[PDB]
């Protein structure tokens, strides 16, 4: 009786929110709008054998989930104060009418599932369980049993079996959501126990496939970097279920739960910049924008996705330690302060429950935390994040482990080169709307920023769906001290015969970008995209050019040979429906500044060097471009790419095979960063080929003593030089050694 009723009440608190004043803004307007939607839904609801609302047939099954969604809105209007429809028996009759129609015509145990599994096993049942919970006492026993038997039919015990296929990660968590509630609502303790127990395989760190990795990476669909959308769905579901079940017979007690809590700062926080979650980790969702089925008309975007992740963090914080909660709330206060693009505290997709959690954080005592300066190399998902005072940057690569891109379900048909060394960035202290402001629906998908590509025309969905296309390469990764980094990609171009070695050296106010071994036989030109910047509608930002640099007002600049650099400023018009079959067709115009190098047709061993200085002033760029001292390119070929930056005491090298660059030598493919600081230095080494075979490094500098070394590092010699043997493992860990200089 009572433990099932207690669980149902707890769920409704989580879902519909508690401890807010319905007459206070933003709650009052949000509730009122929910009443407005509910009244239009009610008036248009039109039951037929094949739909419940016009334009939304049950085949494809998206129409079923869409109908349950409108029924949930209707149910919110009925159960919440302030909606204009609270307790209206006419509205209640129409909800029950819709529910009965769905149960009679489509969502029932005689149906053999067709089309997208997700609609039947995740979209629809979670909504059906929510509506069943909220209306429980009005529905009667036959409606509740009917709902429970639909869920048993579409999500049978065997789905929360084997940790495989469609029952992994974010998906597993979503399945457990419906089975848990089905257990609560149907008073079926075994179903609740099964949902709790089935979460356990979600928690451990993984070394392959879907899940969280030790290095903070998050992978879904086997091969797709996905922290920003799937990872948010996992976090959301987990937070909700942890909160629901706490104190009950079915509380989640697995100690691996703690790894989920750890992931907040290790995995997710680094990818959030002033409210946005970087598009590098949003997979096919970058293409959504305005969705035709979204009755709130809220644009999907990096900021939209970041705000959903922030909301998930707020729910998870409720079961965290005091110390964890305090840190997460400070981060969240900071993202709230700095998000000027989509103000978190009035975000239009948040229902009142999310609003109340976020407002509680904003109102609590505590300081808003800045994003720390530092580097995060998520090697397991081939992503890097760099933060400096002047800028934030995200890099996307691809490898034999990590797909070039994800297309599927009509989404992201032209994202082919999102993994071709794509460097995204934001100038700190300016509005963070670069990628948000109709970027994806207007961009030239042949000229993504940072990438090297064949100009060969590609089909929509070229390479296959769901992360099918991976380049046939191993050496993708890098080495980092947590501040600076050497990062490298052995690139094989999607649908092309292009091969290249690209490297990035992330420094204190710049990213030095090296390209070598650029070879193609496609019979068309090959380009490297120095940058490609959305200027907004009607942009008039000045582009100023010099001998060996270019600068874009409000953005930053590039050190690059001025006679080689090609530039185009143009207006481009597009719609989200160009890149998503589920999106709206309205067309808008954005102005672009595009900068590239042309390697000609069928290059053989072509190369480039350029430096990007995001957020820099025109004078800073001019000075740096004229300064011969600050950077030495030690090597740039298909064997080794390496730099020296004396102002940082830094030598960094990506060794594509055994060899030497400046003062460093390696016996195998490796990434090496050395930092000298006064009388000591730190050497860091990783092995991006991931063979796990030992290799030796020599650093040609006098070294007196070894202060410390990781257990993976053996010291073979000190004196005139440092000679180390490293056993590097198979996950591209950076190993360290710290020595005193002579
Ligand atoms: C992670 C993802 O792309 N999932 C999609 C799904 O979209 C998600 O919808 C959920 C939701 O609660 O309904 C929230 C999340 O923010 C969003 O990305 C999409 O609706 C379905 C059907 O197309 O497919 C999943 O793969």
XYZ file of C-alpha atoms and ligand atoms in Angstrom:
768
model
C 0.000 0.000 0.000
C 1.993 2.687 1.568
C 5.518 2.091 0.128
C 4.076 2.168 -3.406
C 2.007 5.254 -2.596
C 5.094 6.865 -0.999
C 7.137 6.168 -4.159
C 4.412 7.628 -6.376
C 4.256 10.782 -4.336
C 8.015 11.106 -4.331
C 8.050 10.741 -8.150
C 5.433 13.455 -8.522
C 7.573 15.818 -6.358
C 10.506 15.171 -8.662
C 8.403 15.543 -11.758
C 6.061 18.406 -10.914
C 8.153 20.167 -8.340
C 7.705 21.243 -4.793
C 8.139 24.328 -2.584
C 7.599 27.117 -5.075
C 5.036 29.922 -5.114
C 2.787 29.533 -8.176
C 1.971 33.231 -8.182
C 5.695 34.226 -8.393
C 7.525 34.570 -11.682
C 8.849 32.677 -13.588
C 6.451 29.978 -12.273
C 3.253 31.971 -12.883
C 3.897 32.553 -16.590
C 5.173 29.032 -17.185
C 2.071 27.484 -15.582
C -0.210 29.844 -17.467
C 1.425 28.832 -20.809
C 0.999 25.179 -19.947
C -2.716 25.879 -19.570
C -2.713 27.669 -22.896
C -1.105 24.677 -24.669
C -3.410 22.251 -22.914
C -6.482 24.102 -24.073
C -5.351 24.117 -27.719
C -4.447 20.362 -27.490
C -7.815 19.575 -26.091
C -9.631 21.525 -28.787
C -7.703 19.902 -31.678
C -7.578 16.320 -30.295
C -9.179 14.137 -32.999
C -9.238 10.388 -32.533
C -8.981 8.257 -35.651
C -7.779 4.658 -36.257
C -4.355 5.991 -37.266
C -3.779 9.210 -35.153
C -4.913 11.156 -32.148
C -3.943 14.640 -33.456
C -4.080 15.646 -37.161
C -0.707 15.509 -38.932
C 0.612 12.925 -36.399
C -0.095 9.408 -37.565
C 0.876 6.415 -35.411
C 3.075 5.178 -38.266
C 5.787 6.348 -37.987
C 5.654 5.655 -34.245
C 6.827 9.183 -33.462
C 3.134 10.045 -33.656
C 2.365 7.822 -30.644
C 4.997 9.478 -28.471
C 3.847 12.908 -29.733
C 0.294 12.070 -28.599
C 1.432 10.952 -25.126
C 3.441 14.173 -24.913
C 0.370 16.282 -25.534
C -1.535 14.178 -22.996
C 1.214 14.891 -20.466
C 0.857 18.644 -21.086
C -2.865 18.231 -20.616
C -2.237 16.334 -17.391
C 0.131 19.034 -16.111
C -2.648 21.626 -16.770
C -5.062 19.507 -14.772
C -2.866 18.751 -11.754
C -0.915 21.971 -11.299
C -2.288 25.264 -9.822
C -1.957 28.385 -11.981
C -2.744 26.799 -15.340
C -6.285 28.056 -15.742
C -7.475 24.423 -15.970
C -6.582 23.020 -12.514
C -9.062 20.284 -11.607
C -11.317 20.912 -14.638
C -13.397 17.772 -15.099
C -13.828 18.404 -18.852
C -10.043 18.412 -19.337
C -9.848 15.228 -17.292
C -12.439 13.553 -19.485
C -10.474 14.450 -22.611
C -7.222 13.095 -21.123
C -8.894 9.819 -20.299
C -10.454 9.779 -23.743
C -7.037 10.140 -25.383
C -5.461 7.558 -23.194
C -8.246 5.120 -23.973
C -7.928 5.769 -27.672
C -4.178 5.091 -27.630
C -4.686 1.954 -25.591
C -7.394 0.773 -28.020
C -5.767 1.610 -31.302
C -1.972 1.333 -30.975
C -0.194 1.129 -27.583
C -1.302 -2.362 -26.515
C -0.101 -5.900 -26.351
C -1.515 -7.077 -29.759
C 0.742 -4.609 -31.563
C 3.846 -5.861 -33.240
C 6.340 -3.095 -32.909
C 7.247 -1.266 -36.116
C 9.658 1.489 -36.942
C 11.935 3.151 -34.397
C 12.249 0.923 -31.257
C 12.969 4.017 -29.154
C 9.461 5.381 -29.561
C 7.904 2.219 -28.111
C 10.418 1.402 -25.423
C 11.488 4.833 -24.246
C 9.486 7.765 -25.601
C 5.963 6.539 -25.089
C 6.242 4.425 -21.960
C 7.971 7.034 -19.813
C 5.160 9.487 -20.666
C 2.457 6.896 -20.094
C 3.963 6.092 -16.686
C 4.196 9.804 -15.799
C 0.529 10.410 -16.767
C -0.528 7.241 -14.918
C 1.298 8.426 -11.775
C -0.177 11.960 -11.871
C -3.749 10.789 -12.528
C -3.528 7.579 -10.543
C -6.629 7.991 -8.368
C -8.832 9.125 -11.323
C -7.867 6.316 -13.752
C -9.283 3.312 -12.052
C -7.773 -0.115 -11.763
C -8.415 -1.334 -15.315
C -6.583 1.726 -16.841
C -3.595 1.273 -14.529
C -3.428 -2.470 -15.294
C -3.735 -1.766 -18.964
C -0.833 0.748 -18.850
C 1.291 -1.775 -16.911
C 0.647 -4.529 -19.404
C 1.567 -2.275 -22.349
C 4.886 -1.508 -20.661
C 5.393 -5.287 -19.948
C 4.775 -5.960 -23.619
C 7.065 -3.349 -25.125
C 9.716 -3.404 -22.374
C 9.724 -7.036 -21.117
C 12.130 -8.245 -18.405
C 14.503 -9.429 -21.085
C 15.267 -5.808 -22.082
C 16.883 -5.314 -18.653
C 18.870 -8.419 -19.091
C 21.895 -8.587 -21.196
C 23.859 -5.417 -21.220
C 23.989 -5.139 -24.862
C 22.467 -3.786 -28.088
C 19.685 -1.259 -27.353
C 20.000 -1.923 -23.515
C 23.182 -0.052 -22.724
C 24.165 3.227 -21.248
C 21.598 6.069 -21.565
C 19.191 3.622 -23.126
C 19.435 1.160 -20.199
C 18.752 3.997 -17.802
C 15.692 5.062 -19.793
C 14.326 1.560 -19.880
C 14.766 1.252 -16.099
C 12.779 4.471 -15.684
C 9.638 2.998 -17.201
C 10.060 -0.474 -15.529
C 10.645 1.172 -12.111
C 7.475 3.279 -12.395
C 5.565 0.332 -13.799
C 6.590 -1.464 -10.639
C 5.468 1.417 -8.392
C 2.176 1.938 -10.162
C 1.422 -1.727 -10.590
C 2.636 -2.613 -6.983
C 5.053 -5.137 -8.417
C 8.101 -5.181 -6.194
C 9.977 -7.526 -8.497
C 9.796 -4.989 -11.287
C 11.232 -2.285 -9.044
C 14.029 -4.663 -7.883
C 14.791 -5.474 -11.513
C 14.979 -1.789 -12.501
C 17.354 -1.040 -9.538
C 19.544 -4.046 -10.287
C 19.677 -3.288 -13.991
C 21.272 0.041 -13.442
C 24.445 -1.579 -12.010
C 26.134 -2.291 -15.324
C 25.806 1.377 -16.328
C 28.227 2.471 -13.630
C 31.595 0.863 -14.102
C 34.160 2.579 -16.285
C 34.547 0.893 -19.659
C 37.478 0.300 -21.958
C 35.510 -0.138 -25.128
C 32.057 0.652 -26.409
C 29.391 2.521 -24.629
C 29.791 4.205 -21.215
C 32.013 6.363 -19.109
C 35.745 5.891 -19.374
C 38.382 6.500 -16.642
C 39.666 9.552 -18.507
C 36.294 11.166 -18.404
C 35.157 10.276 -21.937
C 31.584 9.278 -22.723
C 30.707 7.087 -25.723
C 27.398 5.991 -27.079
C 26.354 3.973 -30.103
C 29.656 2.150 -29.745
C 31.778 4.739 -31.568
C 30.324 8.220 -31.047
C 31.614 10.900 -28.662
C 28.430 11.763 -26.885
C 28.693 13.444 -23.447
C 26.434 16.291 -24.442
C 23.154 14.555 -25.347
C 23.215 10.866 -24.455
C 25.390 11.630 -21.480
C 22.798 14.137 -20.274
C 19.995 11.577 -20.720
C 21.961 9.111 -18.618
C 22.675 11.738 -15.891
C 19.031 12.898 -15.952
C 17.598 9.409 -15.566
C 20.115 8.436 -12.936
C 19.478 11.538 -10.829
C 15.731 10.982 -11.014
C 15.873 7.264 -10.072
C 18.465 7.806 -7.310
C 16.191 10.459 -5.802
C 13.036 8.387 -6.300
C 14.330 5.183 -4.676
C 16.401 6.664 -1.800
C 15.080 5.498 1.606
C 13.022 2.682 -0.015
C 13.399 -1.100 -0.139
C 14.806 -0.633 -3.635
C 17.317 2.091 -2.984
C 20.346 2.066 -5.366
C 23.188 0.868 -3.115
C 25.861 -0.217 -5.692
C 29.111 1.607 -4.780
C 29.644 2.227 -8.509
C 26.967 4.933 -8.126
C 29.823 7.051 -6.813
C 31.478 6.926 -10.239
C 28.374 8.715 -11.631
C 28.779 11.405 -9.001
C 32.498 11.705 -9.840
C 31.629 12.157 -13.505
C 29.928 15.463 -12.925
C 33.249 17.284 -12.613
C 35.488 14.806 -14.347
C 33.385 14.099 -17.469
C 30.721 16.657 -17.961
C 31.745 19.997 -16.413
C 34.822 20.478 -18.624
C 32.613 20.410 -21.774
C 30.368 23.190 -20.518
C 31.308 26.718 -21.430
C 29.224 29.647 -20.111
C 26.123 27.532 -20.327
C 26.709 25.609 -23.573
C 27.853 21.968 -23.945
C 30.270 21.820 -26.851
C 28.867 20.595 -30.175
C 31.839 18.259 -30.506
C 29.986 15.975 -28.052
C 26.449 16.461 -29.292
C 26.653 14.078 -32.239
C 23.723 14.193 -34.619
C 21.785 16.524 -32.356
C 23.773 19.512 -33.710
C 21.273 19.399 -36.629
C 18.012 19.702 -34.740
C 17.412 23.348 -34.085
C 13.752 24.062 -34.428
C 11.868 20.772 -34.379
C 8.525 20.464 -36.175
C 7.002 18.458 -33.254
C 8.092 20.843 -30.488
C 5.052 22.606 -29.158
C 7.209 25.073 -27.150
C 9.253 26.137 -30.272
C 12.599 26.207 -28.447
C 15.725 26.047 -30.635
C 18.033 23.102 -29.917
C 21.643 24.315 -29.814
C 24.793 23.901 -27.751
C 23.142 26.236 -25.144
C 19.927 24.276 -25.105
C 21.855 21.039 -24.524
C 24.119 22.642 -21.870
C 21.012 23.891 -20.008
C 19.534 20.374 -19.986
C 22.798 19.050 -18.598
C 22.814 21.757 -15.877
C 19.244 20.788 -14.919
C 20.330 17.069 -14.675
C 23.254 18.106 -12.425
C 20.846 19.958 -10.169
C 18.768 16.859 -9.583
C 21.814 14.631 -9.022
C 23.184 17.136 -6.468
C 20.287 16.209 -4.113
C 21.921 12.798 -3.302
C 25.551 14.010 -3.365
C 27.769 14.705 -0.363
C 27.787 18.207 1.153
C 31.172 18.850 -0.351
C 30.154 17.614 -3.856
C 26.939 19.622 -3.693
C 28.767 22.736 -2.679
C 31.261 22.467 -5.585
C 28.531 21.645 -8.198
C 26.351 24.471 -7.050
C 29.177 26.960 -7.382
C 29.874 25.767 -10.904
C 26.216 26.035 -11.696
C 25.980 29.518 -10.249
C 28.834 30.512 -12.495
C 27.268 29.079 -15.710
C 24.031 30.858 -14.723
C 25.839 34.189 -14.326
C 27.736 33.952 -17.589
C 25.078 32.475 -19.961
C 23.909 35.607 -21.705
C 22.759 33.758 -24.828
C 19.947 31.626 -23.191
C 19.418 32.833 -19.588
C 19.223 29.661 -17.543
C 16.749 30.907 -14.984
C 14.078 31.556 -17.520
C 14.959 28.857 -20.094
C 11.740 28.213 -22.007
C 12.050 24.383 -22.070
C 12.202 24.089 -18.251
C 9.079 23.077 -16.518
C 8.433 24.452 -13.020
C 10.309 21.622 -11.259
C 13.541 22.437 -13.062
C 12.920 26.097 -12.592
C 12.541 25.594 -8.809
C 15.779 23.586 -8.526
C 17.787 26.119 -10.477
C 16.351 29.132 -8.662
C 17.207 27.427 -5.360
C 20.866 27.179 -6.461
C 20.939 30.788 -7.684
C 19.427 31.936 -4.395
C 21.610 29.905 -2.087
C 24.717 31.469 -0.425
C 27.966 30.823 -2.192
C 30.170 32.226 -4.848
C 29.806 31.592 -8.553
C 32.850 29.596 -9.701
C 34.790 30.533 -12.889
C 35.778 27.707 -15.276
C 39.341 26.854 -14.305
C 42.166 27.414 -16.744
C 43.425 24.042 -17.951
C 43.421 21.358 -20.514
C 41.302 18.149 -20.614
C 42.305 15.470 -23.108
C 39.450 13.003 -23.441
C 41.492 10.492 -25.328
C 39.045 7.677 -25.247
C 36.566 9.738 -27.222
C 39.170 11.700 -29.316
C 38.161 15.083 -27.937
C 40.221 17.927 -26.324
C 39.087 20.960 -24.366
C 41.410 23.923 -23.747
C 40.727 26.913 -21.439
C 42.934 29.986 -21.163
C 42.164 33.509 -19.906
C 41.544 34.721 -23.499
C 39.598 31.720 -24.912
C 37.967 28.325 -24.758
C 38.439 25.711 -27.516
C 37.073 22.230 -28.317
C 38.748 19.895 -30.805
C 37.101 16.891 -32.520
C 39.024 14.089 -34.118
C 38.161 10.562 -35.335
C 39.933 7.213 -35.263
C 39.402 3.471 -35.505
C 37.579 3.793 -32.074
C 35.623 7.000 -32.833
C 33.376 7.722 -35.792
C 33.811 10.545 -38.227
C 30.231 11.488 -37.474
C 26.761 10.264 -36.686
C 23.877 10.494 -38.965
C 20.572 8.699 -38.458
C 16.770 9.067 -38.364
C 17.053 11.794 -40.943
C 19.475 13.876 -38.884
C 22.943 15.271 -39.647
C 23.282 14.037 -43.206
C 26.234 16.300 -43.984
C 28.387 16.062 -40.788
C 31.084 14.069 -42.599
C 33.964 16.369 -41.623
C 33.012 17.159 -38.021
C 35.728 14.655 -36.975
C 38.436 15.810 -39.455
C 40.398 17.856 -36.914
C 37.547 20.322 -36.266
C 38.659 23.077 -33.856
C 35.763 25.066 -32.344
C 36.396 28.116 -30.095
C 35.021 31.047 -28.190
C 36.684 34.316 -27.206
C 36.248 34.557 -23.419
C 34.204 37.430 -22.068
C 32.139 37.807 -25.323
C 28.675 36.405 -26.053
C 29.126 32.607 -26.509
C 26.757 32.265 -29.500
C 29.120 31.358 -32.353
C 27.693 27.854 -32.903
C 24.278 28.675 -31.511
C 23.125 31.446 -33.864
C 22.029 29.504 -36.961
C 25.569 28.170 -37.503
C 24.713 24.589 -38.519
C 21.863 25.317 -40.896
C 23.936 27.897 -42.866
C 27.517 26.602 -42.676
C 29.402 25.177 -45.648
C 29.854 21.571 -44.509
C 32.880 21.315 -46.794
C 34.680 24.012 -44.792
C 34.407 23.276 -41.086
C 36.949 25.166 -38.976
C 40.366 23.546 -38.491
C 39.766 20.642 -40.796
C 41.697 19.274 -43.753
C 39.450 17.874 -46.471
C 39.214 16.804 -50.011
C 36.805 19.036 -51.874
C 35.195 15.942 -53.441
C 31.380 16.181 -53.333
C 29.831 13.601 -50.922
C 26.376 12.079 -50.734
C 24.119 12.765 -47.842
C 24.839 10.051 -45.172
C 28.057 9.039 -46.919
C 29.908 6.409 -44.795
C 26.703 5.059 -43.173
C 24.597 5.838 -40.117
C 25.055 5.430 -36.414
C 28.785 5.988 -36.318
C 29.575 3.349 -39.012
C 32.377 5.398 -40.721
C 35.695 5.336 -38.868
C 39.027 6.209 -40.393
C 41.404 3.218 -40.599
C 44.074 4.747 -38.262
C 45.479 4.165 -34.810
C 47.588 7.229 -33.970
C 44.978 9.679 -32.640
C 45.583 11.167 -29.141
C 48.113 13.288 -27.298
C 49.924 14.128 -24.089
C 48.973 16.813 -21.587
C 50.190 18.204 -18.229
C 46.691 19.414 -17.492
C 47.557 22.938 -18.731
C 49.226 22.600 -22.168
C 49.003 19.801 -24.662
C 50.344 18.110 -27.776
C 47.571 16.551 -29.757
C 47.744 14.632 -33.056
C 45.441 13.068 -35.600
C 46.365 10.669 -38.310
C 43.633 11.636 -40.686
C 41.988 9.586 -43.385
C 39.209 11.607 -44.945
C 35.623 10.390 -45.056
C 34.772 8.999 -48.517
C 38.102 10.192 -49.840
C 41.662 8.989 -50.535
C 42.934 11.855 -48.363
C 45.538 11.131 -45.786
C 47.240 13.690 -43.532
C 49.005 14.170 -40.188
C 47.541 17.042 -38.180
C 48.854 18.303 -34.890
C 47.770 20.932 -32.412
C 49.871 22.452 -29.662
C 47.667 24.141 -27.078
C 49.578 26.964 -25.416
C 48.910 29.951 -23.111
C 47.165 32.245 -25.617
C 47.316 30.386 -28.941
C 46.958 26.998 -30.659
C 49.747 26.167 -33.086
C 48.490 23.998 -35.882
C 50.779 21.799 -38.021
C 49.820 19.737 -41.033
C 52.003 17.370 -43.036
C 52.026 14.378 -45.389
C 48.844 15.754 -47.031
C 48.204 13.367 -49.888
C 45.246 12.708 -52.045
C 44.325 11.022 -55.355
C 40.657 12.186 -55.656
C 41.502 14.373 -58.678
C 40.070 17.513 -57.023
C 41.603 20.198 -54.712
C 42.304 19.626 -51.065
C 41.938 22.415 -48.508
C 42.789 23.151 -44.925
C 40.255 25.436 -43.213
C 42.185 28.026 -41.191
C 38.892 29.204 -39.893
C 35.275 29.588 -40.613
C 33.429 32.036 -38.429
C 29.719 32.914 -38.240
C 29.418 36.709 -38.156
C 25.732 36.704 -37.497
C 23.068 38.286 -39.689
C 24.413 41.265 -41.523
C 27.760 41.091 -39.763
C 30.171 43.972 -40.273
C 33.176 42.793 -38.194
C 36.356 44.084 -39.788
C 38.756 41.583 -41.321
C 42.221 43.129 -41.365
C 45.056 41.441 -43.226
C 48.776 41.712 -42.996
C 51.868 40.119 -44.488
C 51.622 36.972 -42.401
C 48.419 37.383 -40.416
C 44.712 38.114 -40.460
C 42.460 39.457 -37.744
C 38.679 39.364 -37.297
C 37.158 42.009 -35.073
C 35.426 40.548 -32.003
C 36.831 37.087 -32.716
C 40.627 36.836 -32.815
C 43.271 36.196 -35.430
C 45.595 33.893 -37.337
C 49.267 33.803 -38.103
C 49.444 32.327 -41.586
C 51.298 33.245 -44.840
C 49.258 36.086 -46.255
C 49.863 35.339 -49.862
C 48.771 31.665 -49.459
C 45.688 32.479 -47.364
C 42.404 32.564 -49.228
C 39.417 34.423 -47.821
C 35.686 34.676 -48.594
C 33.024 36.725 -46.889
C 29.551 35.745 -47.987
C 25.908 35.484 -46.930
C 24.548 31.959 -46.718
C 20.907 31.110 -46.264
C 19.520 27.850 -44.861
C 16.914 26.062 -42.812
C 17.188 23.377 -40.167
C 15.136 21.190 -42.582
C 18.121 21.206 -44.896
C 20.037 19.098 -42.286
C 17.200 17.358 -40.404
C 14.056 15.788 -41.786
C 12.261 16.504 -38.469
C 13.021 20.224 -38.392
C 11.209 23.322 -39.498
C 11.643 24.861 -42.983
C 12.085 28.465 -42.231
C 15.113 30.031 -43.893
C 17.467 32.551 -42.384
C 20.625 34.292 -43.599
C 23.974 34.441 -41.819
C 27.200 36.118 -42.885
C 30.417 34.130 -42.839
C 34.166 34.804 -42.850
C 35.946 31.776 -44.282
C 39.739 31.422 -44.419
C 41.567 28.496 -46.058
C 44.724 27.189 -47.677
C 44.481 25.391 -51.009
C 46.911 22.415 -51.303
C 46.037 21.981 -55.019
C 44.741 18.895 -56.821
C 46.256 15.593 -55.830
C 48.823 16.834 -53.380
C 51.649 14.545 -52.440
C 53.154 15.391 -49.013
C 51.739 18.919 -48.791
C 52.001 20.741 -45.435
C 50.854 23.786 -43.486
C 51.672 25.783 -40.371
C 49.318 28.347 -38.869
C 48.652 29.669 -35.376
C 45.219 30.637 -34.157
C 44.897 33.262 -31.388
C 41.362 33.298 -30.264
C 40.316 36.455 -28.446
C 43.574 38.282 -29.313
C 43.738 41.949 -30.341
C 44.896 43.056 -33.771
C 48.096 44.504 -32.189
C 48.831 41.277 -30.348
C 48.538 39.281 -33.555
C 50.711 41.709 -35.575
C 53.421 41.498 -32.890
C 53.349 37.728 -32.660
C 53.399 37.342 -36.438
C 56.517 39.568 -36.601
C 58.254 37.826 -33.622
C 60.749 35.233 -34.980
C 61.697 34.033 -31.459
C 58.544 32.864 -29.787
C 58.027 29.660 -31.711
C 60.316 27.204 -33.388
C 58.925 24.532 -35.605
C 61.423 21.753 -34.865
C 59.876 19.397 -37.418
C 56.775 19.174 -39.598
C 56.622 16.064 -41.731
C 54.842 12.737 -41.814
C 57.275 11.261 -39.353
C 57.355 13.974 -36.594
C 55.643 17.258 -35.831
C 57.216 19.249 -32.997
C 57.587 22.757 -31.567
C 59.649 24.659 -29.112
C 58.094 27.563 -27.170
C 60.809 29.057 -24.913
C 58.493 31.495 -23.097
C 56.833 28.384 -21.641
C 59.989 26.348 -21.280
C 58.158 23.920 -23.522
C 59.143 21.287 -26.073
C 56.333 19.268 -27.562
C 56.435 16.534 -30.187
C 54.077 14.112 -31.920
C 56.176 11.237 -33.209
C 54.265 9.423 -35.953
C 56.955 6.706 -35.796
C 60.335 6.269 -34.131
C 62.682 9.173 -34.656
C 63.947 12.474 -33.338
C 62.763 16.064 -33.186
C 64.910 18.761 -31.654
C 66.123 17.447 -28.241
C 63.768 14.458 -28.152
C 64.091 10.956 -29.469
C 61.645 8.068 -29.307
C 61.748 4.381 -30.260
C 58.081 4.253 -31.202
C 55.028 6.421 -32.033
C 54.403 8.656 -28.968
C 53.405 12.149 -27.875
C 55.901 13.990 -25.618
C 55.666 17.222 -23.692
C 58.644 18.590 -21.715
C 58.302 21.635 -19.458
C 61.335 23.316 -17.912
C 60.649 25.545 -14.902
C 63.758 27.042 -13.297
C 65.870 24.243 -11.867
C 63.504 21.402 -12.625
C 61.575 19.903 -15.567
C 58.679 17.570 -16.082
C 58.554 15.144 -18.972
C 55.262 13.684 -20.002
C 54.746 10.902 -22.489
C 51.847 9.107 -24.047
C 51.498 6.350 -26.663
C 48.621 7.137 -28.977
C 48.990 4.065 -31.203
C 47.938 2.131 -28.052
C 50.018 -0.998 -28.714
C 51.050 -1.074 -25.071
C 54.634 -1.947 -26.107
C 57.466 -0.385 -24.115
C 59.336 2.442 -25.747
C 62.276 4.606 -24.807
C 62.552 8.373 -24.808
C 65.759 10.403 -24.664
C 65.697 14.114 -23.806
C 68.946 15.868 -24.669
C 69.351 18.158 -21.683
C 71.673 17.725 -18.677
C 69.703 16.202 -15.785
C 71.116 15.760 -12.250
C 68.564 13.663 -10.335
C 65.083 12.215 -10.690
C 62.597 13.783 -8.220
C 59.790 11.496 -9.119
C 58.535 9.050 -11.708
C 55.351 7.153 -12.343
C 55.519 3.371 -11.814
C 55.267 2.998 -15.568
C 58.544 4.927 -16.070
C 61.952 3.322 -15.592
C 64.999 5.667 -15.550
C 67.762 4.254 -17.671
C 70.211 7.138 -17.431
C 70.654 10.724 -16.114
C 73.721 12.973 -16.567
C 74.212 14.492 -19.991
C 70.700 13.428 -20.850
C 67.608 11.805 -19.627
C 66.849 8.308 -20.840
C 63.574 6.627 -19.917
C 61.754 3.465 -20.709
C 58.008 3.712 -20.552
C 55.403 0.909 -20.350
C 52.506 2.871 -21.641
C 49.415 0.885 -21.603
C 46.636 0.866 -24.144
C 44.515 3.878 -23.267
C 46.851 6.799 -24.095
C 47.549 7.758 -20.473
C 50.142 10.430 -20.064
C 53.016 9.172 -17.875
C 55.327 11.602 -15.950
C 58.835 11.971 -14.655
C 60.129 15.091 -12.796
C 63.862 15.784 -12.710
C 66.290 18.288 -11.335
C 68.381 20.105 -14.128
C 72.189 20.445 -14.366
C 20.064 11.586 -26.950
C 19.149 11.642 -28.191
O 19.427 12.228 -29.281
N 18.030 10.987 -28.027
C 17.017 10.912 -29.042
C 15.772 11.705 -28.670
O 16.021 13.044 -28.268
C 16.118 13.311 -26.922
O 14.793 13.354 -26.336
C 14.851 13.261 -24.926
C 13.488 13.091 -24.318
O 13.360 13.065 -23.087
O 12.490 12.875 -25.051
C 15.723 14.359 -24.303
C 16.988 14.730 -25.074
O 17.318 16.081 -24.729
C 16.879 14.605 -26.600
O 18.155 14.646 -27.236
C 14.701 11.666 -29.771
O 13.500 12.279 -29.351
C 14.420 10.230 -30.103
C 13.335 10.049 -31.198
O 13.845 10.703 -32.322
O 15.584 9.550 -30.506
C 16.597 9.529 -29.478
O 17.649 8.847 -30.030
